[PDB]
């Protein structure tokens, strides 16, 4: 009970900042997650024995892909940690518990392929789940791990608290389907400007939690340039592999996934920052002002990609 986790001084300070990089020492990531659960939630939220067993089961069910891997999981949970800590009083005991777990689990058993690739391949998961295919899988995998003997980190919640948290986690993981983000931010944008946004409205919280999930999921764009730059290589390594597989099915992939069109990456990063990332952190900042440094970092990186096009690097 009195057994805290503690981090070296530099990590203890930097972990509290949005732009924190969890670093290349795999073996420290579980301890970093527990540390975040303890400060964000309390040392009582979960039985340590059970949390540690759940953490390592989740780790095992992430695969060795260039980007959608265990390191992505922990990175995306740290971003949620930073948002929750800079917005102390806006979230319930249950939401702080649920959202960190949701973020750790949100890409469980990812194979590095899009929902589109699964449908064109005619993958069995595409039959089971016609929309948000991988995301429904990720929730499925999350439930499965929660039902392993000794893995129920929520066992001390009442019957209805338990159902609320699994529902928070389900909506949270579904929301990471970027196809659903555009309409979610549009609605949040309209509600904020007409002044109808009400955080006591459960359907409104759902939407705000959803946008937080998109913000955490894309957090690689909110790091220092060298982190953002080197992650982009891992993102494209999956995309070009997926394009390779599209060609094997006799389909020309979209340019994004065509390794023949590497040259156009800087332009494609601009489209993405402008079409997705900037809108996302802007609406997030409007709703939760203390999340501004994510917008500020994203804009710096937008500017870094602009400099690459102009052959300044
Ligand atoms: C849109 N577009 C078009 C092109 C392109 C490139 C070359 C030729 C023609 C076109 N390059 C992009 C960028 O896509 C892209 N997608 C991301 N998501 C989407 C879903 O999977 C998770 C990651 C992403 C996530 C993060 Cl964190 C950071 C950067 C990202 N960049
Ligand atoms: Mg995903
Ligand atoms: Zn993800």
Helix axes 202-217, 181-194, angle to 10 degrees: 130
In whole angstroms, give the CA distance from residue 42 to residue 284: 26
Give 142's contacts (C-beta < 8 A, 6+ positions apart): 101, 102, 105, 108, 169, 173
Rounded distance from Cα 195 to ligand 2 centre (Å): 31
Which of the following is catalytic: 38, 68, 110, 151?
68
What is the helix, strand, coil percentage profile of the chain, to 5?
A: 70, 0, 30
The tokens describing 147, both together, are: 């039902």
In whole angstroms, give the CA distance from residue 116 to residue 230: 25
Does CATH number 3.90.1150.10 belong to domain 28-310? no
Helices (H) and strands (E) in the chain, counts: 15, 0
Give 91's contacts (C-beta < 8 A, 6+ positions apart): 84, 99
Alpha helices for 122-224 (secondary structure H): 124-128, 133-146, 159-174, 181-194, 202-217
Dihedral (CA of 6, 215, 135, 88) sign = positive
Residues with CB under 6 A from ligand 1: 178, 218, 220-221, 232, 235, 255-256, 261, 264-265, 268-269, 271-272
Pocket test for ligand 1, best of 227, 269, 274 (most atoms within 8 A of CB): 269
How would DSSP label each residue in 18-77? Answer: TT----S-GGGHHHHHHHHHHHHH-SSSS-HHHHHHHHHHHHHTS---SSSSHHHHHHHH
Active site residue 68: yes
Q: Are 266 and 309 in contact (CB under 8 A)?
A: yes
In whole angstroms, give the CA distance from residue 107 to residue 177: 10
Q: Is 269 annotated as a binding residue?
A: yes
């Amino acid at each position: 009970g009195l057994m805290q986790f503690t981090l070296p001084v530099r990590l203890c300070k930097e972990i509290e900042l949005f732009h924190f990089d969890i670093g290349p020492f795999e073996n420290m990531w579980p301890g970093i997650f527990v540390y975040m659960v303890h400060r964000s939630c309390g040392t009582s939220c979960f039985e340590l024995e059970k949390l540690c067993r759940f953490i390592m089961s989740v780790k095992k069910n992430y695969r060795r892909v260039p980007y959608h891997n265990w390191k992505h999981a922990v990175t995306v949970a740290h971003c949620m940690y930073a948002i929750l800590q800079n917005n102390h009083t806006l979230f319930t005991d249950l939401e702080r518990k649920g959202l960190l777990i949701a973020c750790l689990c949100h890409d469980l058993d990812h194979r590095g392929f899009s929902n589109s690739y699964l449908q064109k391949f005619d993958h069995p998961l595409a039959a089971l789940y016609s929309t948000s295919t991988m995301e429904q899988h990720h929730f499925s995998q999350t439930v499965s791990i929660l039902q392993l003997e000794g893995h129920n980190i929520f066992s001390t919640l009442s019957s209805s608290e338990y159902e609320q948290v699994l529902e928070i986690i389900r909506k949270a993981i579904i929301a990471t389907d970027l196809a659903l983000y555009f309409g979610n931010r549009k609605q949040l944008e309209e509600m904020y400007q007409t002044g109808s946004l009400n955080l006591n409205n459960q359907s409104h919280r759902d939407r705000v939690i959803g946008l937080m999930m998109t913000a955490c999921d894309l957090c690689s764009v909110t790091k220092l340039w060298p982190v953002t730059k080197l992650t982009a290589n891992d993102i494209y390594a999956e995309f070009w592999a997926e394009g390779d597989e599209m060609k094997k099915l006799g389909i020309q992939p979209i340019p994004m996934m065509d390794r023949d069109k590497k040259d156009e990456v800087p332009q494609g990063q601009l489209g993405f920052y402008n079409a997705v990332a900037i809108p996302c952190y802007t609406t997030l900042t409007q709703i939760l002002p203390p999340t501004e440094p994510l917008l500020k970092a994203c804009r710096d990186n937008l500017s870094q990609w602009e400099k690459v096009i102009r052959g300044e690097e």
